[PDB]
Each structure stands twice: as C-alpha cells, then as structure tokens.
C-alpha cells in the first residue's frame, strides 16, 4: 500500500516464528521497541497486528514512537508507548521503474495531525488561502497527495523501502498467538519454573478444588497475585503454592 | 532540489522566450509544478503555474495576457512560453512546486536570468 492508505491484518491462533525474521540477512533494519528482537520467541500474545507500506529511504526513521515528520504526523503514525517491532527493506528492483512509479503515494499536507494508527484517505482539496477552492487547484488550492515517482537511480535515500510493522497486544487476556515452544508433561507436587501459554512463575502446582466460570483463564487473590490458572491442553484448574522457604 | 533550469538569456522586448526546467520523478510526482520569478529588490512570486492531475493552468494576473505553460511527462519536464516580453519582466526565473516551501524539503536551484531590453 501507499503510506497514505496503509494496509491492516490480524494475526491469530498460530505459531509465530520470530527468528525467521530476525536473523533473516535480507533487512536493512530491524528495531524493536519495548521488547528485545531476540526474546519474540519466547512470548506470548492476545494477537498481532501487521501494519504495511512503502515509503522513501530518508523517512524510514519516522516510522517509530515519539518522532514527527510528514509520514509521522500525516500518513501513519505510532503512539509513544508503542510496543512492537519495526522492519523495512529495500525494494528499489521491485517498486523503482524507469521513467518513475507515481502509484505510490503520501499525504504532503492535512489540516490537522493524525492521532495513532489513523488512516486518512480523503481525496478533498486543500485550502491555503482564504478562497474556498470549490474542488478546484490554482493559487492556494492543492491536492493533499504527492506521488513518489520512484527511479532506479536514484540515490539510496530517495529509494522505495517496504516497511512492516508488527504492534504487539498484551493483555490478561488468554493468549492467540505464541512462539515456536515445545510443551512438556505437567507434574505435580515438585517446585517447577513454569510457563502456562504466556503466563510464568515458580512455584508447586496442586490440583484446585475451586471453580471457574465457563470464560475465565486464571485467577488471582487478595494481594492481585496469581492464585490458580487453568492448564490450555487440559481443561483443568491448578493451584500455585510458594515454593517453602524461611529463614535460618 | 533535484530540477535543472534553462532556456534563460537576453532579448528585446516583444516576440518571445522558452523556459524549460527538468525534474526528477520526486518532484514531478508533485500535485503542481510552476515558475516563479524573483527580480532584484522585490519578493520571489508564483508566476504561473500547471496541476499534475487534469493539467489545470493558472496564471498571476500580470502575465495572463502573454504567457503560456505547460508540462511533458513523457519527459518529466516542465514548459514556459512567454510571449510579448516587456522590460517589466525582467527577473531570474525558477523552476519549483506550487507548494515550494522548505517546509516540504523544498530547495531553490539556480533559477535562470531573464533580461528583457527596450
């Protein structure tokens, strides 16, 4: 997609491999915020949310909280406590052609900035005057959108790049997307570091003799702790206990 | 920044001078394209300008009568034909978008000199 009408997907109720990404050679970068790239693996998620378009190369650095800019305040936007994973690459044999690629587009001007993960793709003239332009471009009316006319050679900041983003949802909510982890046999009654789809500790797990309603993943005591989860191949509800400790 | 000018020089005043400037697919790409004109001790102005959709021409009052512009994309370039030049539009004349403006990452080029003798 152009930036100015950037593409959206869902990812969920899959296996989510990180390092296929990660250690592929082939991007130019590859920065994450809130979470070290080489951790993604290991950590679960609600869902994931994959952001896609092409931008120029001297603008991949707006692409990332806090920053401004014309892409950062008019075409897309991230919030400044973002968490999530930005990765570009160059696309100049793809989206570069002779004569230049005006399919691309970005909004140059807006009368106002866009909040985070807005879209706008409204086609209505510009005023920049007093004069109402009535649909109409001359002196102080112009079209919001500019095309790129990307070219073969042209230097490399003014080369296309592919740009996805990768926003991750964390929530209490169960998780609907994990990495690629191998489970293990439950046991019972020993002290265990654990791993309930997303949800660690250390602890000795006792079947509960409590109930949970239909829709409820874990629970929690009076000190907003974990008391108890529920096991995501069995259906079943465990207790954590402290491992013992005291002092000597 | 990435536009060549050309087709300045010196003429008399009447019969006619073609400007013509180049561009890059970054700023031929642009919603507008036009020349502006700056003579010495004044301001630069828009003196006419071509829409990169529909072909839309406009002109600065004090020019309607006489000049002429226009754009070649098979080229990605841009045209001036001034006819009927007078003294009074003497000036270096540039090649820029509609919305030029440093705040765009806009830069002026060399522009061209325009004399127009009696």
């Known amino acids: 997609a152009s930036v100015y009408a950037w593409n959206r997907k869902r990812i969920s109720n899959c296996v989510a491999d990180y390092s296929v990404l990660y250690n592929s050679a082939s991007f130019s970068t590859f920065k994450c915020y809130g979470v070290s790239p080489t951790k993604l693996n290991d950590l679960c998620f609600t869902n994931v949310y994959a952001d896609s378009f092409v931008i120029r190369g001297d603008e991949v650095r707006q692409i990332a909280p806090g920053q401004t800019g014309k892409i950062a305040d008019y075409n897309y936007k991230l919030p400044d406590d973002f968490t999530g994973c930005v990765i570009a690459w160059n696309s100049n044999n793809l989206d570069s052609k002779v004569g230049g690629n005006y399919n691309y587009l970005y909004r140059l001007f807006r009368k106002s900035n866009l909040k985070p993960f807005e879209r706008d793709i409204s086609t209505e003239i510009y005023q920049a005057g007093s004069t109402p332009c009535n649909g109409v471009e001359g002196f102080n009316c112009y079209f919001p959108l500019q095309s790129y006319g990307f070219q073969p050679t042209n230097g490399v900041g003014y080369q296309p790049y592919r740009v996805v983003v990768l926003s991750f949802e964390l929530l209490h909510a169960p998780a609907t997307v994990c990495g690629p982890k191998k489970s293990t046999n439950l046991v019972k009654n020993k002290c265990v570091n654990f791993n309930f789809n997303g949800l660690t500790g250390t602890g000795v797990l006792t079947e509960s003799n409590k109930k949970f309603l239909p829709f409820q993943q874990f629970g929690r005591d009076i000190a907003d702790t974990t008391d108890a989860v529920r096991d995501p191949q069995t259906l079943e509800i465990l207790d954590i206990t402290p491992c013992s400790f005291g002092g000597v | 920044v990435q536009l060549v000018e050309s087709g300045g020089g010196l003429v008399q005043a009447g019969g006619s001078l073609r400007l013509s400037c180049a561009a890059s697919?970054?700023?031929?790409?642009?919603?507008?394209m036009g020349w502006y004109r700056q003579a010495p001790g004044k301001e630069r102005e828009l003196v006419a300008g071509?829409?990169?959709?529909?072909?839309?021409?406009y002109y600065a009052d004090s020019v309607k009568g006489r000049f002429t512009i226009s754009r070649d994309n098979a080229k990605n370039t841009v045209y001036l034909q001034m006819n009927s030049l007078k003294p009074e539009d003497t000036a270096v004349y540039y090649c820029?978008?509609?919305?030029?403006?440093?705040?765009?990452?806009?830069?002026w080029g060399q522009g061209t000199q325009v004399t127009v003798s009696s």
């Open positions: 820029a978008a509609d919305p030029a403006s440093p705040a765009y990452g806009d830069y």
């Open positions: 697919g970054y700023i031929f790409g642009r919603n507008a």
């Open positions: 071509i829409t990169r959709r529909g072909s839309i021409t």
